Amino acid sequence: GDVTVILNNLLEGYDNKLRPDIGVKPTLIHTDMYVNSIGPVNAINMEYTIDIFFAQTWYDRRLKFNSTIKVLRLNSNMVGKIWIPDTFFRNSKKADAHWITTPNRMLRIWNDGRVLYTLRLTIDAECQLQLHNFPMDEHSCPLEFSSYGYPREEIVYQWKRSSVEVGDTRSWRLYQFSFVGLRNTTEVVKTTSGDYVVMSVYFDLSRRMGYFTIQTYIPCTLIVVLSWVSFWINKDAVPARTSLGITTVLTMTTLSTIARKSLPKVSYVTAMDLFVSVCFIFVFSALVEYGTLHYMDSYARIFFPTAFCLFNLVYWVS
Amino acid sequence: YIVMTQSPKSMSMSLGERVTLSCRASEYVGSYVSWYQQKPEQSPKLLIYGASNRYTGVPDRFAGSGSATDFTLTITSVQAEDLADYHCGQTYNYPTFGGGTKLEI
Amino acid sequence: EIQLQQSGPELVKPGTSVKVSCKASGYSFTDYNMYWVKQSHGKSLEWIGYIDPYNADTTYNREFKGKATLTVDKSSSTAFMHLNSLTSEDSAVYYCARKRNNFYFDYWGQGTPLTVS
Amino acid sequence: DNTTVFTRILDRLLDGYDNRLRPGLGERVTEVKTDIFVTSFGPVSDHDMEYTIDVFFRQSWKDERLKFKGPMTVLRLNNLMASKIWTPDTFFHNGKKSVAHNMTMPNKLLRITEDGTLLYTMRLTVRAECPMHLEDFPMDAHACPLKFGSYAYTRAEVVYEWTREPARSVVVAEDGSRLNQYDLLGQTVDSGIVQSSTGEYVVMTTHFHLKRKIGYFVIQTYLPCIMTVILSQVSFWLNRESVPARTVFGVTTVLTMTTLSISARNSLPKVAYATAMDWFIAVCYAFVFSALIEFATVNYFTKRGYAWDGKTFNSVSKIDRLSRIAFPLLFGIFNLVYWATYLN
Amino acid sequence: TIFTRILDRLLDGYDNRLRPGLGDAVTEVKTDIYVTSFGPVSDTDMEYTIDVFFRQTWHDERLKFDGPMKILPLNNLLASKIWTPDTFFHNGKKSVAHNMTTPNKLLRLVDNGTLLYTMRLTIHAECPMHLEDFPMDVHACPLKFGSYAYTKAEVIYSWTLGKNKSVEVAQDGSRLNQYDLLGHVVGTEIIRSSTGEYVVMTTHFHLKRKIGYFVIQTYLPCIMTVILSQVSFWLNRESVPARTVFGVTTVLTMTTLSISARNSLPKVAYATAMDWFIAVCYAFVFSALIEFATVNYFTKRSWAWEGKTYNSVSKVDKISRIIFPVLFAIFNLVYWATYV
Amino acid sequence: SNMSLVKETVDRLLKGYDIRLRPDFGGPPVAVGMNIDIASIDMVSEVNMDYTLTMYFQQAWRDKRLSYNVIPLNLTLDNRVADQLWVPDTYFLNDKKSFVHGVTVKNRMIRLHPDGTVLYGLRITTTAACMMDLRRYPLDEQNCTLEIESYGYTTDDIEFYWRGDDNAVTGVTKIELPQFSIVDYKLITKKVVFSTGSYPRLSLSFKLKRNIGYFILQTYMPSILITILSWVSFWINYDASAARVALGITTVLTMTTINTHLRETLPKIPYVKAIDMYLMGCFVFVFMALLEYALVNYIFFGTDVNAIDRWSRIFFPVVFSFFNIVYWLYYV
Amino acid sequence: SNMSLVKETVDRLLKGYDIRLRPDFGGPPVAVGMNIDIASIDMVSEVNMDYTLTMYFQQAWRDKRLSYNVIPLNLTLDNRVADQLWVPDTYFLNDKKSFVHGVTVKNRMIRLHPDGTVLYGLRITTTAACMMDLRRYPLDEQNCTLEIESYGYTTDDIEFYWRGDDNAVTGVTKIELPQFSIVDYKLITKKVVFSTGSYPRLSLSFKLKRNIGYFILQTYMPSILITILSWVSFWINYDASAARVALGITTVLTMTTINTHLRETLPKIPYVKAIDMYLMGCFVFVFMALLEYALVNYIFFGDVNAIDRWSRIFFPVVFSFFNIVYWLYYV
Ligand SMILES: *[C@@H]1O[C@H](CO)[C@@H](O[C@@H]2O[C@H](CO)[C@@H](O[C@@H]3O[C@H](CO[C@H]4O[C@H](CO)[C@@H](O)[C@H](O[C@H]5O[C@H](CO)[C@@H](O)[C@H](O)[C@@H]5O)[C@@H]4O)[C@@H](O)[C@H](O[C@H]4O[C@H](CO)[C@@H](O)[C@H](O)[C@@H]4O[C@H]4O[C@H](CO)[C@@H](O)[C@H](O)[C@@H]4O)[C@@H]3O)[C@H](O)[C@H]2NC(C)=O)[C@H](O)[C@H]1NC(C)=O
Ligand SMILES: *[C@@H]1O[C@H](CO[C@@H]2O[C@@H](C)[C@@H](O)[C@@H](O)[C@@H]2O)[C@@H](O[C@@H]2O[C@H](CO)[C@@H](O[C@@H]3O[C@H](CO)[C@@H](O)[C@H](O)[C@@H]3O)[C@H](O)[C@H]2NC(C)=O)[C@H](O)[C@H]1NC(C)=O
Ligand SMILES: *[C@@H]1O[C@H](CO)[C@@H](O)[C@H](O)[C@H]1NC(C)=O
């Protein structure tokens, strides 16, 4: 045929190992990315799954041809044959391309020599979630990438005219957060191997309260309401008042455990943990007040909700 | 070290009678227990290898059995030739043999 | 058809040393370790030590350590045993066996009486 | 040129080498002198009745095709050379799901002695299976087998042998004890034959005699069980008059026992036969339920409700005092019989 | 031996990178699905697994032959050698092409030139789920698939048998444990991309969640908790320890039911219909507790009745025991009628 | 000498060997015989609705091209030659995750017999699926099957059978499943037809009965004991409202916890389980006991009060007993 | 000409190269220098007694075969060339499940230097297993090591070292584990001897010290607050058995469920850990707190106010004595 001879001409005497114009100049790569869906944010492991259509346009002098056809639109069979930017995602914990039914990649070679290499990926990128004000924490989870081996001298990244090709956010698996926006940055990092040109996309995400509200917040709040209910009940009912107090603190311990187990375990107090701790000192004070009563009550009846209300107002301001 | 204890030191079984030997190692030896025949002025000749299996060229009269630490070499139809000292060896560890079980018509 | 032929009987006096050989036939010497066995007259068989012919490594009985030295010649297929500081208790007949597997000693030496008086 | 001689040697060895055919195929049986160096005895997954073991599975076999006479006596080659030559298809008869580590590169050393005595060790995470009869669990010594033989070849084709004395073959590194709850007493080696549909296989059984340490379950199960029983006994001391407090004690104790019984069973596999722990739990269940039945009987004869002050009051239940002495005693005798029966 | 000569004739001078009739015309892949077993639907991950016989048929001019045999069934390995469409699932997350004992694939070259290419997959395809009516909800899970590299001027897809016959689902082979497969509707559309225009099929499997599982695991325990709360009213108000322990225990189970339900639920802000039911049940039990709170205010006598002023039964208790079941009943009937 | 002879033979056999074409292509269907040797049926997971079947799986098809007569012995080659040999494209239709065992080398057996018979073999931990009717769980006698079938070869090109008839499956009696008991295994040769055509099916089947002793220890007997615990409230005085109610809701809540724990440990199925039928029955018993306590409280506050206690005390164990008798009559 | 010259040079290097023979085979060992840059320590799974460590494992060595003098620059070939070159058969003896990252192409670096040195980098996620001795946990200063060791080459054929005494390991200070804190890391070089010979080994030995406040909030706060709750029972009136008995059982039951919850999370350890020793201490205190009421009731039905007061003051005192002895014993 006419395209097979062109393909064989391109691959004849083609050194897959060497990059385009090695030493001659830093090969310029444009890496305009498409986002299919930002998966669930695995805050427990400080990582997030993102499904991307990563396209890297790099001008390869070796892949040039002249004919009536203006571009060769090839499948993933050709990706291994040609030189590929050995791009790795710097904060990726577990990443894997899609392979079924055939490898999910495309490769287009233009007549001039521009090569557009798009591939589908499911990257579990890392981001550091500082959970100091959990769950009211708006994060900016980044993703990064550059060539693992090639230094800044031999490979340079850039963004193309379309900065990021974000898809329809409605079909995204972002359950707790809401995708706020995209910020793209190019920086240079120095390591033992050398100095690279890393390119870090920043996905700004805003957390909401739809799951934590009824799983822990409203339950613990109503447990505090049960502590309020303790004061109103008659003092003469000794076993009943004690039974309510001990059951309330049991609820607090169970809720503090379910709250901690749901959250990633960290070496600092969170706003969720400060909230549960304040409810703990509240119920503990309620039981201490009943114990003192056994050995006034009306003041405590109004005092506890007022302090709780001010605590809530301080939380809403923060 | 392992010690092999042939229980009957001497026997006087008649020809054709089923004559049974019994040997016991102090510790575990697995199946690696062998029975050897020591005729006078003759080197030992292997008769049973791996506790139950028979060496090549051995007559079928020598039936050997038993699990680890308890072994038996029974000559059901003993003849004049098959009447001499028998030693139970072992090789599960550094090898050690046992006191000869002598026979006399 | 494997025959382990030894040197033969020896008569000595206390204090000196005796070297006893064991020339295996048939199977290659290096292939199988050579175990040395002592038969005290009227007593059971006692293992002395085995020498791996290929690399000349040795392992000796704890009771026999020092008193017995194992050296193997491979140019001529033979395993030697040097017995030193001979006493009355060492008068016995010595055999050289062969270990075929982890189960059985395949073939045994003809027998080397040793007398000390 | 320094390394060219060894390149020509290796290319001479692999020249005409059919790695599909075993040594002496049709001429002699293949003697596989194999020994094991347990780098670490991984945690025994008692839930799946399997145990992980990390080993240097050394195996040596003379191969007359790999004869050479060069400057070096032993060719310490890389793992790439291993796939170029015949290695035995050794598989573990009870190996459920294992993997040979290959990070960074394959962890198999291939040493060719000049006479052709191959030595082919590999690192392995053998997740082998033990048929466990956990009837005396946790006090259950297990002879966890490690049976390995050739999948394809029969005893007439390859026969497996130990490199050294059978006791001096399966060596274990002193520091390599990943056993969280078990304790490797030792290893007993045995070689035998197993009959199969295709033929007779030689098998190298290796019973790793693991003694399970009760220290995990003494505090995990046994101490909470015993303390729950003595809680149910703390009931007895408490006065019959207080019906809510004694009843709540009995109910909480039996509810605890239920949660403990399910927690205990959760750890072990869903075997039909009750474990020794299960018998201990059942007896403890009998004790707590007996204590609650005891208080139900006392309440049956508890004529009065109001308690002692400073107008006839209740008397201390004859059942209360009898159970006060008997139940500790009965438990103690049961416990002594239990520990003596199972520990010995 | 002749079939080897024909097969090598076909593969000789063959380029597996180029399309069937590349440039001359657009190739028309034709797809038909035979779901062997519609695997479990993962509600937590919003993904569903399907084990399907993925038949694809396409006319390839290079792969035509004349010989003693008409149709040539070949080994699955030859699939690699010949050009296959680069079909990828637009919602496929983690698929598997089974290789036991060998690659589970089929490849027949019909005499005219048409190829038939099959594979047993396990597609963990994405299915976005709107759970605002969960559990009694209907989901239209799509199964999209189209060429990853070939534009609409290069590759197109068109169902072979038709709208109803192309997708076959054996009812006996239905691994749907908690779901009911109402049906399947097939559509074909076009996707516009910055890289090009592509043909995209879609098999909207309409699945009805089986209420029979969540009526048992979560709905019935909640109903029992609500009944227990109403049982508290039937208990005497003088039994303050009894009412207190009843209230706290009922609230505690209701909370653990909500937590377990959200454990089964992805952490979304939908506030599902199941969550709505658990919420109204929570309000019922908590209102019962508030009723005990207000009745405890007026327990002036504080002495029980024997059978010396005895406490009169609270009017709130009498009204509660009659309309709390009635309000729960009508709220249930409204709930079921609204969602059914 | 002999090694060169074997090398020449296997070299001739694998020379010019088209792996892509089945034996006697354009001819009669090749009769594939199978004789499975089960190593274990461990981990029969009803949560995932499947069972792992560690098995020695042997095929015994006859291949004409693999005919040699000079060598008298059976050529048992390495597993690697299997890659170079036409293997039937067989698969397990209900397989979910399967793999040939890896260590030390791939677990395959190739045995070229002189007559041309080929004895392929594998060691497979297939996680074969079988839909389970948990309506009788845990007393169900589940009939789980392994459906060996040819994927690409229709009946015109291949046919499956069991070498040695019922004795094809070996060692199933030796298998000791923890909760199951393999009570019966059956061999049948179906012929399933798909759109592509008819195919040969070997739905090797086991009927495996779940042992009830384990579920008694873990599920049933604790439920019975909790039911008796609930019945203890009949023995308790009615006026001890706090104690009786504490026993009441503790038993009811424990039953709810156990049921939810079971459902967490059990798969997501709509049909009521037999274990769930017993759990619901015990729930009705404990609930009715609590309702009885509510009834006596209402009667006393809002002789007869002792009478209802006495006859409920006698009637309840009898009702539970006959409930159990009806239960085991229903299932066992 | 430049690109073609580089092509010819690399074609010259890889032509005739043998992957089987190590550098200077049949000669002095090649000094292979290790260098590590810890990307992060993902998880420290006490449950499985191992930790996950993502690294940039760089190994540089002098291979005279891979020496090029024509071009005055450092080549960095595609990672697939590593399959065609010799690399040390390094293995982490602690590793249980480890891999080199794959996306997009395999995470790997090959930068040949003009003199002959190779720089074989790899991005490796290793689930290294360090058998942790938890008798001080959570006040435990554990070690966890990476046993970088050659498998097939004894000390007569290879020799590991750290390029730079402490410049070979980098990026460790920046790391932040929510569970742990790397107080110190050591570099060790040894020659371990097995039956097959003596091999050179390197040990990267992190002395990770546990974050105490993590547990003072997570695991210890329930223990201490529960103990205070147990003390709360000592102010209630003696004629409140329905209350004090219920609270005492409730407290000890809470301690049991907490202790079981922790030991369910923690592995099947056979000894009393310091967390276990503290939970046991609290368990003893809360059981004796129950037995206080047991005794009061006993004495009254089958002074008592004084016994309550003495328990009120004695229990915090001896509990503080237990606490301080525990703290000074383990910190
Ligand atoms: C240590 O052991 C491990 C295994 O425990 C080895 O890892 C395996 O290595 C082999 C070979 O090096 C890999 O095979 C390759 O697989 C490619 C597709 O892989 C996907 O499918 C496999 C199942 O087959 C999955 O297991 C993979 O998932 C795993 O790997 C990815 C990263 O790869 C991880 O992210 C995952 O989490 C998993 O860990 C993948 O999903 C396959 O395409 C490839 O075949 C091409 O390349 C060979 C090279 O010779 C060609 O001969 C062949 O023809 C193919 O080339 C065509 O197609 C490509 C497509 O791009 C074109 O580019 C070409 O030009 C040409 O047209 C090859 O078969 C295997 O994936 C891998 N992992 C396993 C088994 O899990 C390590 O190598 C070993 N050593 C070390 C040092 O670690
Ligand atoms: C079925 O399995 C794999 C590929 O399929 C995969 O299987 C599971 C692991 C799942 O992950 C599935 O999702 C997935 O589809 C096949 O492995 C490949 O086998 C061939 C030979 O059959 C290998 O080719 C050889 O490679 C060696 C490398 O040294 C060469 O020396 C040989 O000359 C030959 O080319 C190929 O490398 C291998 N691919 C891998 C391991 O990634 C497997 O063969 C297949 N089953 C059958 C029967 O073919
Ligand atoms: C292609 O051919 C045209 C016409 O001769 C020429 O101008 C152009 O430079 C060629 N491009 C190449 C050789 O890359």
mmCIF file of all heavy atoms in Angstrom, chain A residues 76-77 79-81 95-96 99 103 105, chain D residues 102-104, ligand 1:
data_model
loop_
_atom_site.group_PDB
_atom_site.id
_atom_site.type_symbol
_atom_site.label_atom_id
_atom_site.label_comp_id
_atom_site.label_asym_id
_atom_site.label_seq_id
_atom_site.Cartn_x
_atom_site.Cartn_y
_atom_site.Cartn_z
ATOM 1 N N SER A 76 -2.687 2.099 19.047
ATOM 2 C CA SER A 76 -1.657 1.928 20.058
ATOM 3 C C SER A 76 -0.612 0.893 19.675
ATOM 4 O O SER A 76 0.275 0.617 20.483
ATOM 5 C CB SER A 76 -2.279 1.545 21.395
ATOM 6 O OG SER A 76 -1.306 1.605 22.421
ATOM 7 N N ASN A 77 -0.733 0.244 18.522
ATOM 8 C CA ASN A 77 0.319 -0.675 18.109
ATOM 9 C C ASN A 77 1.629 0.059 17.859
ATOM 10 O O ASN A 77 2.709 -0.522 18.015
ATOM 11 C CB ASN A 77 -0.111 -1.433 16.855
ATOM 12 C CG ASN A 77 0.974 -2.342 16.326
ATOM 13 O OD1 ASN A 77 1.813 -1.929 15.529
ATOM 14 N ND2 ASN A 77 0.973 -3.587 16.779
ATOM 15 N N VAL A 79 2.835 2.850 19.445
ATOM 16 C CA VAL A 79 3.423 3.652 20.522
ATOM 17 C C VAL A 79 4.787 3.107 20.931
ATOM 18 O O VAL A 79 5.747 3.867 21.102
ATOM 19 C CB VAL A 79 2.467 3.773 21.726
ATOM 20 C CG1 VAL A 79 2.037 2.435 22.254
ATOM 21 C CG2 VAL A 79 3.141 4.534 22.836
ATOM 22 N N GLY A 80 4.906 1.786 21.059
ATOM 23 C CA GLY A 80 6.164 1.203 21.484
ATOM 24 C C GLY A 80 7.267 1.381 20.470
ATOM 25 O O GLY A 80 8.435 1.516 20.842
ATOM 26 N N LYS A 81 6.922 1.361 19.185
ATOM 27 C CA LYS A 81 7.938 1.418 18.143
ATOM 28 C C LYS A 81 8.691 2.745 18.166
ATOM 29 O O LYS A 81 9.920 2.766 18.046
ATOM 30 C CB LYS A 81 7.293 1.185 16.779
ATOM 31 C CG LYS A 81 6.459 -0.084 16.685
ATOM 32 C CD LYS A 81 7.324 -1.327 16.770
ATOM 33 C CE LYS A 81 8.356 -1.353 15.659
ATOM 34 N NZ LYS A 81 9.226 -2.550 15.755
ATOM 35 N N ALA A 95 -0.592 3.805 39.365
ATOM 36 C CA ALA A 95 -1.162 4.289 38.122
ATOM 37 C C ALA A 95 -1.062 3.195 37.079
ATOM 38 O O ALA A 95 -0.070 2.463 37.028
ATOM 39 C CB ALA A 95 -0.462 5.552 37.649
ATOM 40 N N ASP A 96 -2.084 3.101 36.238
ATOM 41 C CA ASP A 96 -2.140 2.053 35.235
ATOM 42 C C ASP A 96 -2.936 2.543 34.042
ATOM 43 O O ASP A 96 -3.988 3.162 34.199
ATOM 44 C CB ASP A 96 -2.769 0.778 35.808
ATOM 45 C CG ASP A 96 -4.084 1.042 36.535
ATOM 46 O OD1 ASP A 96 -5.143 1.043 35.876
ATOM 47 O OD2 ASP A 96 -4.057 1.243 37.770
ATOM 48 N N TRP A 99 -6.165 -1.202 28.972
ATOM 49 C CA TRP A 99 -5.654 -2.164 28.012
ATOM 50 C C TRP A 99 -6.716 -2.912 27.227
ATOM 51 O O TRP A 99 -6.367 -3.611 26.272
ATOM 52 C CB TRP A 99 -4.773 -3.199 28.718
ATOM 53 C CG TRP A 99 -3.665 -2.591 29.467
ATOM 54 C CD1 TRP A 99 -3.672 -2.215 30.772
ATOM 55 C CD2 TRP A 99 -2.369 -2.280 28.963
ATOM 56 N NE1 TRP A 99 -2.457 -1.685 31.117
ATOM 57 C CE2 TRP A 99 -1.638 -1.713 30.020
ATOM 58 C CE3 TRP A 99 -1.755 -2.424 27.719
ATOM 59 C CZ2 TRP A 99 -0.327 -1.294 29.872
ATOM 60 C CZ3 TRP A 99 -0.456 -2.007 27.574
ATOM 61 C CH2 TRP A 99 0.247 -1.451 28.644
ATOM 62 N N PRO A 103 -4.839 -1.772 23.756
ATOM 63 C CA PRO A 103 -4.321 -0.661 24.563
ATOM 64 C C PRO A 103 -4.975 0.665 24.204
ATOM 65 O O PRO A 103 -5.097 1.025 23.033
ATOM 66 C CB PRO A 103 -2.828 -0.661 24.240
ATOM 67 C CG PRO A 103 -2.530 -2.052 23.938
ATOM 68 C CD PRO A 103 -3.730 -2.596 23.235
ATOM 69 N N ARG A 105 -4.589 3.826 23.698
ATOM 70 C CA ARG A 105 -3.731 4.927 23.290
ATOM 71 C C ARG A 105 -3.981 5.233 21.823
ATOM 72 O O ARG A 105 -4.449 4.386 21.063
ATOM 73 C CB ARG A 105 -2.246 4.608 23.481
ATOM 74 C CG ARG A 105 -1.873 4.058 24.830
ATOM 75 C CD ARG A 105 -0.386 4.024 24.990
ATOM 76 N NE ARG A 105 0.001 3.306 26.195
ATOM 77 C CZ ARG A 105 0.364 2.034 26.213
ATOM 78 N NH1 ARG A 105 0.403 1.310 25.108
ATOM 79 N NH2 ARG A 105 0.702 1.476 27.369
ATOM 80 N N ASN D 102 11.043 -10.936 42.249
ATOM 81 C CA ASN D 102 11.898 -10.512 41.148
ATOM 82 C C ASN D 102 12.159 -9.008 41.179
ATOM 83 O O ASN D 102 12.346 -8.378 40.135
ATOM 84 C CB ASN D 102 11.310 -10.949 39.809
ATOM 85 C CG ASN D 102 10.111 -10.145 39.411
ATOM 86 O OD1 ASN D 102 9.262 -9.805 40.231
ATOM 87 N ND2 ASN D 102 10.041 -9.827 38.133
ATOM 88 N N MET D 103 12.269 -8.434 42.372
ATOM 89 C CA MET D 103 12.509 -7.007 42.549
ATOM 90 C C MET D 103 13.753 -6.841 43.407
ATOM 91 O O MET D 103 13.728 -7.163 44.598
ATOM 92 C CB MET D 103 11.305 -6.323 43.199
ATOM 93 C CG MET D 103 11.511 -4.862 43.570
ATOM 94 S SD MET D 103 11.810 -3.772 42.169
ATOM 95 C CE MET D 103 10.592 -4.349 40.989
ATOM 96 N N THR D 104 14.840 -6.344 42.815
ATOM 97 C CA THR D 104 14.948 -5.557 41.585
ATOM 98 C C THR D 104 14.946 -6.416 40.331
ATOM 99 O O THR D 104 14.193 -6.163 39.403
ATOM 100 C CB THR D 104 16.220 -4.699 41.596
ATOM 101 O OG1 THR D 104 16.139 -3.750 42.664
ATOM 102 C CG2 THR D 104 16.386 -3.972 40.292
HETATM 103 C C1 LIG H 1 8.975 -9.049 37.586
HETATM 104 O O1 LIG H 1 7.766 -9.774 37.488
HETATM 105 C C2 LIG H 1 6.671 -8.975 37.021
HETATM 106 C C3 LIG H 1 5.438 -9.837 37.123
HETATM 107 O O2 LIG H 1 5.207 -10.242 38.465
HETATM 108 C C4 LIG H 1 6.956 -8.491 35.604
HETATM 109 O O3 LIG H 1 5.912 -7.615 35.200
HETATM 110 C C5 LIG H 1 5.375 -8.021 33.929
HETATM 111 O O4 LIG H 1 6.286 -7.842 32.844
HETATM 112 C C6 LIG H 1 5.744 -8.240 31.577
HETATM 113 C C7 LIG H 1 6.867 -8.147 30.569
HETATM 114 O O5 LIG H 1 7.871 -7.242 31.005
HETATM 115 C C8 LIG H 1 4.548 -7.359 31.223
HETATM 116 O O6 LIG H 1 4.008 -7.825 29.992
HETATM 117 C C9 LIG H 1 3.613 -6.711 29.175
HETATM 118 O O7 LIG H 1 2.251 -6.447 29.412
HETATM 119 C C10 LIG H 1 1.728 -5.379 28.653
HETATM 120 C C11 LIG H 1 0.338 -5.121 29.152
HETATM 121 O O8 LIG H 1 0.346 -5.272 30.553
HETATM 122 C C12 LIG H 1 -1.016 -5.181 31.011
HETATM 123 O O9 LIG H 1 -1.564 -6.466 31.087
HETATM 124 C C13 LIG H 1 -0.904 -7.307 32.023
HETATM 125 C C14 LIG H 1 -1.413 -8.701 31.817
HETATM 126 O O10 LIG H 1 -0.861 -9.208 30.605
HETATM 127 C C15 LIG H 1 -1.185 -6.751 33.412
HETATM 128 O O11 LIG H 1 -0.650 -7.623 34.383
HETATM 129 C C16 LIG H 1 -0.514 -5.389 33.509
HETATM 130 O O12 LIG H 1 -0.759 -4.808 34.781
HETATM 131 C C17 LIG H 1 0.462 -4.751 35.553
HETATM 132 O O13 LIG H 1 1.426 -3.881 34.958
HETATM 133 C C18 LIG H 1 1.121 -2.459 34.950
HETATM 134 C C19 LIG H 1 2.295 -1.757 34.315
HETATM 135 O O14 LIG H 1 2.638 -2.452 33.122
HETATM 136 C C20 LIG H 1 0.843 -1.989 36.377
HETATM 137 O O15 LIG H 1 0.502 -0.612 36.367
HETATM 138 C C21 LIG H 1 -0.312 -2.812 36.942
HETATM 139 O O16 LIG H 1 -0.692 -2.326 38.220
HETATM 140 C C22 LIG H 1 0.071 -4.284 36.977
HETATM 141 O O17 LIG H 1 1.180 -4.364 37.865
HETATM 142 C C23 LIG H 1 -0.995 -4.461 32.396
HETATM 143 O O18 LIG H 1 -2.295 -4.046 32.798
HETATM 144 C C24 LIG H 1 1.751 -5.800 27.195
HETATM 145 O O19 LIG H 1 1.224 -4.754 26.407
HETATM 146 C C25 LIG H 1 3.191 -6.096 26.771
HETATM 147 O O20 LIG H 1 3.204 -6.588 25.445
HETATM 148 C C26 LIG H 1 3.842 -5.615 24.596
HETATM 149 O O21 LIG H 1 5.246 -5.538 24.857
HETATM 150 C C27 LIG H 1 6.043 -6.701 24.505
HETATM 151 C C28 LIG H 1 7.485 -6.379 24.838
HETATM 152 O O22 LIG H 1 8.298 -7.458 24.382
HETATM 153 C C29 LIG H 1 5.836 -7.030 23.026
HETATM 154 O O23 LIG H 1 6.577 -8.193 22.694
HETATM 155 C C30 LIG H 1 4.348 -7.268 22.772
HETATM 156 O O24 LIG H 1 4.138 -7.667 21.421
HETATM 157 C C31 LIG H 1 3.553 -6.024 23.130
HETATM 158 O O25 LIG H 1 4.028 -5.017 22.251
HETATM 159 C C32 LIG H 1 2.980 -4.544 21.383
HETATM 160 O O26 LIG H 1 2.000 -3.791 22.086
HETATM 161 C C33 LIG H 1 2.476 -2.586 22.738
HETATM 162 C C34 LIG H 1 1.323 -1.939 23.449
HETATM 163 O O27 LIG H 1 1.774 -0.677 23.921
HETATM 164 C C35 LIG H 1 3.099 -1.679 21.697
HETATM 165 O O28 LIG H 1 3.585 -0.525 22.346
HETATM 166 C C36 LIG H 1 4.238 -2.444 21.005
HETATM 167 O O29 LIG H 1 4.930 -1.610 20.089
HETATM 168 C C37 LIG H 1 3.693 -3.693 20.330
HETATM 169 O O30 LIG H 1 2.781 -3.226 19.345
HETATM 170 C C38 LIG H 1 3.873 -7.086 27.711
HETATM 171 O O31 LIG H 1 3.323 -8.358 27.427
HETATM 172 C C39 LIG H 1 3.493 -7.435 32.320
HETATM 173 O O32 LIG H 1 2.458 -6.483 32.104
HETATM 174 C C40 LIG H 1 4.118 -7.165 33.694
HETATM 175 N N1 LIG H 1 3.133 -7.199 34.781
HETATM 176 C C41 LIG H 1 2.384 -8.210 35.289
HETATM 177 C C42 LIG H 1 2.516 -9.594 34.684
HETATM 178 O O33 LIG H 1 1.613 -8.006 36.221
HETATM 179 C C43 LIG H 1 8.280 -7.738 35.556
HETATM 180 O O34 LIG H 1 8.632 -7.454 34.208
HETATM 181 C C44 LIG H 1 9.396 -8.558 36.201
HETATM 182 N N2 LIG H 1 10.644 -7.803 36.243
HETATM 183 C C45 LIG H 1 10.848 -6.670 36.933
HETATM 184 C C46 LIG H 1 12.219 -6.079 36.818
HETATM 185 O O35 LIG H 1 9.974 -6.140 37.617
#
